[PDB]
Structure 1
Amino acid sequence: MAHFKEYQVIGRRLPTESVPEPKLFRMRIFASNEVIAKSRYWYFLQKLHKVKKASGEIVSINQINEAHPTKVKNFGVWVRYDSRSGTHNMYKEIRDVSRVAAVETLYQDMAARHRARFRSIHILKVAEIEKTADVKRQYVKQFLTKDLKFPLPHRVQKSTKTFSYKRPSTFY
């Protein structure tokens, strides 16, 4: 659609005479529209038990908005997927801009290295990094200093006109 947001999917199974108020399952599924998030909810929760699968109801479907988009810190999401050569329980600590943008950038990297299938990407708990010490990443702390200057080559010159006295160059 546009961007994988966050929704609130809550289940209750069958609050009837059989099992009055089971456990009320609730997670934080990250998906685009309100269609994929429903299936991934059943995909991440395959530990359900013998009741009925035809009872695909939602307690209160809504939309968990991005918590503080301007707040830029460090987060960690455990990457898990089952390929054909086995599996990989990975975990990155890349500096995320928001709290949901990490998932979008995850599809730009994991599919660029080990070719992660879209029907195998698992979503677990999202960790949060505030202080140092526990930070085992060097490339993250290096880019996070104070009053640091650096030159930047390469420049954009998007044009189509066949007339120029500028003599194109790259300086930024």
Structure 2
Amino acid sequence: MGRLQEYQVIGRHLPTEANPNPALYRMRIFAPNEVVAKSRFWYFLRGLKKVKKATGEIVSVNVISEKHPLKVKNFGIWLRYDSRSGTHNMYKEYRETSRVAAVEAMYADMAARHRARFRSIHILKVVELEKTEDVKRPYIKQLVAKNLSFPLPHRVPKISTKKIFSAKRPSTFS
């Protein structure tokens, strides 16, 4: 749902006389910016711990950068999405180089295949698959195959849209 970053958002309830040291709650939020990250954080604690924005505060917001953005990884995402029937579990796999890229591809995938918007999707877990045997889906199992190689048949050549006419008929072999 856009250029996202993963944010560590830590918040708490405001201290009182009865409770001088309230507990701290940390979440990992995929959001375009810090305002959306804090808003989603307060939404989830309103849904979980009955802590409101007016009676609480944000302790910390930090950006979680990918440890190895130049390494190709397989990601398993467990999600719940809301449709006219109700809430459904889904497990899906994405071959990406970062968690934020996996989550962006997930959002585009659910939009394409189930018409699910951002508000109806809850991301419950995003994990990196440690082993090749942990891959469940055939469309990632074919990509992690040994000695993978394929050609690219029927490639349309890149022709400028401002060049209206061509003197030769293009080829689709390279």
TM-score (ref. length: structure 2): 0.85
Does the residue aligned with 2:141 lie in a helix, a strand or coil? helix
More helix by share: 2
Amino acid at match of 2:48: K
1:44–1:158 Cα change, 3 Å = farther
Superposed CA offset, 1:81-133 (max 9, x none): 22222121111022122121011111211011211022111122212212133
For residues 36-51 of structure 1, the aligned pairs below 5 Å read 36-45=36-45, 46-49=47-50
2:156 matches 1:155: yes
**C-alpha contact (below 8 Å) 1:7/1:29 kept by paired residues:** yes
Does the residue aligned with 2:37 lie in a helix, a strand or coil? helix
Amino acid at match of 1:170: T
Superposed CA offset, 1:37-56 (max 9, x none): 1121123331113x654134
Q: Which residue of 2 aligns with 1:12?
A: 12
2:79 matches 1:75: no
**C-alpha contact (below 8 Å) 2:157/2:170 kept by paired residues:** no
Superposed CA offset, 1:129-160 (max 9, x none): 12133332222122113433311022332312
More strand by share: 2
2:25 matches 1:25: yes
1:121–1:104 Cα change, 3 Å = same
- Find runs of 4+ consecutive structure 1 residues off by over 4 angstroms: none
Does the residue aligned with 1:94 lie in a helix, a strand or coil? strand
2:117 matches 1:117: yes
For residues 46-125 of structure 1, the aligned pairs below 5 Å read 46-49=47-50, 52-125=52-125
Inter-partner Cα distance in structure 2 for 1:89 and 1:70: 31
Identity percentage of aligned residues: 71
Inter-partner Cα distance in structure 2 for 1:132 and 1:87: 30
CA displacement at 1:163 relative to structure 2: 4.2
**C-alpha contact (below 8 Å) 1:79/1:90 kept by paired residues:** yes
Structure 2 portions without partners, runs of 5+: none
Structure 1 portions without partners, runs of 5+: none
TM-score (ref. length: structure 1): 0.86
Amino acid at match of 2:116: A
